[PDB]
From Swiss-Prot, chains A, B, C, D, E, F, G:
PANTHER family, sorted: SMALL-CONDUCTANCE MECHANOSENSITIVE CHANNEL
Subcellular location field: Cell inner membrane
Record organism: Escherichia coli (strain K12)
Family per similarity comment: Belongs to the MscS (TC 1.A.23) family.
Highest classification ranks of the organism: Bacteria, Pseudomonadati, Pseudomonadota, Gammaproteobacteria, Enterobacterales
Protein name stated in the entry: Small-conductance mechanosensitive channel
């Protein structure tokens, strides 16, 4: 009945091990952190290393009480698969949680459509990205769902491009409408005039004739450029005599 | 025939074990609860620890009646996978059930669209969140389905932003419509006048000309701000002589 | 050739076991039923316990005829996976079959939209819920498909809320339309007048001007409240002189 | 070279076994069929029992020719997984193939929408249900796809309910339209007058004013009740002087 | 160095086996083909039987050169799983490839909608069905995608049913329109007059009043029956004085 | 310390094996290529055979340095599953990559809709098919995505069929419109007049009466046949006096 | 107590191995890089080879401290499956990351629609492709999502093709509209006149008669060709007297 030495051989080896465990991780990601591989690639890889050691420890600590050793791998591994399954979801969120910090297709502050919802990005935490619609809402999207989808990024390209489609009446001057516009974009300062600058007759529409105007600006400029150019095209087409035709329709009339 | 000692060696070890089991969990999450790691990360992890011990116990208790030990891992593990499979669904709901309490992208009482349905959030219980449409319905969404999807949060940002689009007739004053509006938002007290405050000519529409007005308010204020500002723009555009044009259409007439 | 003792050692152990089997379940869920854990958590867990015992029994009963024991785990476990696979579907239905009875987000008799189809709920049996559209159809939805989806519940909130949107002509009295309405909801008895009670100018519409009216009632009351309030707003807007404008359209006329 | 006794030890044991196999199934579902558990739960469970015995047989019959026994479990089990995979689809169809005969949410002859396609059902065979659109087409739906989806059942509720929405002109009599209708449903014999019977002003529509009429009938009656009640409401609204208004539209006229 | 007897012990056993292999399949589906179970259930099951024998053979042929036997099951089984995975797709197509020949919900030549695309079917080969839109296109649908989906079958029901919806003006004769139609279907020979034959007032429409006419015909007849009956209803409604009303609309006129 | 013979026993067996490996594949698909089974069924099957031999080799080469042999199956097999997983995607593309060359539902040059995108098919390489929209775009579709979906094939049927729907006014000649058309298709040479050739009154439309014309042509002919037949029906309906009615609408007029 | 030789036997073998490891990879992809198989097929395959060697090393290094060896395969392999699972996502992105450098269906700079979003492609890095909408946005699409989907490629075909649909009035000259157009495309220099060049009467439309014009150009030319040809067809149809008819509608008039 000092076969209950085993009982202390357990608590010997459990704590002999738990302590040689926790220090081989602090010394695994001692190396990793200084190799500067990553912050949470360290914590994932090293707390794994730490963990397979507590794993080995439990086996010899149990074996020296009399536990089959082939059923330690069983119970552990299986009940490991429990913890796995449950946190399997979030573990995938952490993949893109690191994958979003490096590469950063979008970086904090940019405006991005991703997964259909679009806003300015506050922070990419470990599981989720937080953003703000220019509306004043907080949208929080799972990192996984983000990296699976198209990341549309409005900011990281410094030169964006406007597109006006404008309608005139069918009997308007095909050339005057081109020249008033050409001169309207020539007289704007926030329009890059080395880049694309097209104004042409695009569509023989339903009730109208549609001219398209494409003019690249600075990123920050772009929003205001449109509003200022439209402010004008309304007056300078009115003053010039051109009509923005109301929906036109020919009626063929019959008294029955 | 005292080989039926085994039969009592079972009930010895089954109950020797069941009792050393149930107390190593109460002592595992004794540590976890005081390390304050979580409420149900304790109950999940510790009732696992408790459980792999009843698992080991069944093996030696059976082995000392004469059960193959390699078919205890079989039956158990397999019939474990039964219990797993069946409750595998809800186990994932509990993931986000803890994952929603920490982080809380939305906290109790906020208004949120998540998974398309939108309401004010009562409680995030273990499997499901409960909410109330401002309509007076109870919607209960599975925690899993929530954490997989975009969490849109209207409340946690304290400053929200309205957007009026208003139409005038084509021959209205391009500047007066800007100034009446500019003065309408200047005279509102619940409008933050340090933040964005744009009023411009946005769209050369079908039958109308459309001015957009964007003015940030307080979160709670926002709903009423719109209703009060629209109450005005209707009168102050009427009194000013501006027409909100009915759908306009040119008819080209022919007696056949 | 009394090596066919084995043959009776089988039928000994098969029936020695089948009987020690069926009584350890009746005694497992003897405990479970009295611990009152559940009705079918008993039947699932206990008929599992009963079953792993018939499982062990088959192994020693075969082994004492001369069956490899490692191919009993094979055949059984594998042909177990057959039965599993086939009934794996319904086993998930039974998850939500118990999961619906406890929690009951919706209880028998309530009106609920769930999975898009909506009705009053008769019974939640083990696999499926049965409901009745207020139309007079029986819809039976799998319990699984239910618990995966939004459960929208109209009844369990005792106070519901109506929403009228009403149109007037553009030259109607912005204040009279507010006061006739305000007085129409003041004079209804089934309207909770402590709760929300808004009437405002909501939309500068196409051919009309739209006032929204939001008034909370009792759950049972709500359906009739609308019908009775609309009955009135039609007359009291007619008698008052206000026109519910037919679709308005300006024609600009030209002889060609 | 009478080590080719083994060769006959195989054909001994293969056929010794194949025959003790096929008779333990006929005697397994001898019990099952008389316990009346089911027709094809017998054939599935028993032809499994029969089968794990041909499985054991192959192992000892091969082992006594000199086949590794651990590679019989391999080949068999694996090549079992072949047969499984291939027929895994249909095996799930057979789940709902039995699951549709018991419970029968819909029974032969009823009219049901399920999976969107809707018809009258004649037979639920082992894999598939066959139905007839009231059109005269045969639609055959896989049993699996059925049990996964909403089963909408029109027949098993004996009392169904019609819903008329009818429009009048804006200047019609709000009360007369209620009384003509009330009297039209009072004078129909196939209308249950103890059940719901509402006639009210439901919608202040575009060009019309819409009254809703809800009246429960017998299941078989319901189709004809509508046709007969509409036959009337057309005449009794014509004779009464009420107009079913053609699409109304106000034109504001301008010579340009 | 006659330990390279092993080397010939391999080629002995490899070819001793390959030949006892290929003849136990020819003799397995000798039995199966004559039990007439199927054509390709033979080829699938028997070429499996043939195959697990080449499988056993490789193990003893390798073992007698000195290959671990537990790594033959490894390599084979695993590299088996390669072949499996790759052809796993088509193996499922062959399931429904046999599953379509038996049962044949649709048989060669019938017109069927299945998976949305619809045509006349001329062959169900092993993996795929081929069809012809009545347009003159060849559509080839994977057998798998077919058996998963609703099989809509127009031909196998010999009596199909037409449905005319026809509009008259609001002031047409409610009874005459019923009698002209009733007499139009009475005078057609290809209309089964024992079966359903309804003509009633179905819809109080927008600009018209709509009568529905339902008359069952022979399968082959049905296409022409409609074209011939419509040919008539156009003239016999014209000759009778009934107007098929052009879209009606009331204009309420105002000089502004 | 000539226990480093082992070290050369490795490089002995690694290269003894690598060479007996690479030549049993060249001799496996020596047989396969001459059995002409396929080009890449050879390369897949044979480079598998070659590979399980390098696999066996590594085990004995390692074992004779002192590697556990049960952890060679581990590392290999597992790190095999790495390579598998990564290239598992493309391996499925190669399935249909061979599966499209045999059967070829579409062969190079045909016009096909498959997966919704439609064009003329250049080449079916190992992973992907390349096509050209008649537009002048290159669309490259994964072979997998192709074989999973409906393959619609316009070319392989040599006789295609046009369908004109044409409208006349309500008071047009029901018979003349049939005879002008009948004679228009009688006078075309590229119309097969033995095949289907229907011209009938199909739809009592909104503002028009619609005649359908169905006439089968040669595949290549079909595109031009329509254009040439429509060229005519426009004139021969104009010359005949028949009107293609502009959208008709009855106005019921009221001075308010 | 020089049984802690083992402890140094570990650090012997761990570092004896780690170093024979890291150099057999540098020497595996020494061969691979010079066989020029690929850049990252080297890094994937070789860092695998390097890795299964650190894997073997850990087993003998642990075994000579006293670790079960069968639980090294367990812990490693299992905790391997951790790392696998987490990076399993991106590993599939790297598949198409190499798969989109070879083959390159689209090469850097081309304009492509893929996965619905369309732009000019900057770079195909290891996980993701980056592109620029001609708008001025950066869209970054996961390589996986790309190779799964249709790659539509506008550039790699050097000859693209325009398509004009133009409407005239019903009483326009069927031949003149053909000849003005024919001459408009005859007089353009950037139109390949050897390739397709069709101008025909395509659609007998609602309010108009629609002529289609198909003319192939150079890739770069195509955008401008349309704009220049439409510029003309507007004037040369105006000057010729042809009317682009406003939406036509016959009114049948009635005083009520």
């Amino acid at each position: 009945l000092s076969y209950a030495v085993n009982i202390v051989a357990a608590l010997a080896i459990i704590i002999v091990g738990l302590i040689i465990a926790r220090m081989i991780s602090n010394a695994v990601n001692r190396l990793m952190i200084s190799r500067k591989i990553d912050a949470t690639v360290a914590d994932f890889l090293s707390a794994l290393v730490r963990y397979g050691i507590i794993a080995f420890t439990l086996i010899a600590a149990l074996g020296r009480v009399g536990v089959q050793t082939a059923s330690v791998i069983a119970v552990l591994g299986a009940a490991g698969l429990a913890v796995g399954l449950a946190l399997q979801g979030s573990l995938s969120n952490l993949a893109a949680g690191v994958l979003l910090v490096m590469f950063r297709p979008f970086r904090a502050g940019e405006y991005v459509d991703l997964g259909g919802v679009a806003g300015t990005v506050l922070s990419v935490q470990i599981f989720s990205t937080t953003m703000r619609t220019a509306d004043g809402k907080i949208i929080v999207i799972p990192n996984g769902k983000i990296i699976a989808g198209n990341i549309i990024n409005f900011s990281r390209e410094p030169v964006r491009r406007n597109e006006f489609i404008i309608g005139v009446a069918y009997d308007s001057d095909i050339d005057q409408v081109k020249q008033i516009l050409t001169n309207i974009i020539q007289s704007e300062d926030r329009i890059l005039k080395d880049r694309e600058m097209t104004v042409r007759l695009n569509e023989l529409g339903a009730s109208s004739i549609n001219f398209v105007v494409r003019v690249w600006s600075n990123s920050g400029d772009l929003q205001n450029v449109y509003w200022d150019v439209l402010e004008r095209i309304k007056r300078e087409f009115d003053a010039a005599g051109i009509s923005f035709p109301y929906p036109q329709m020919d009626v063929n009339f019959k008294r029955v």
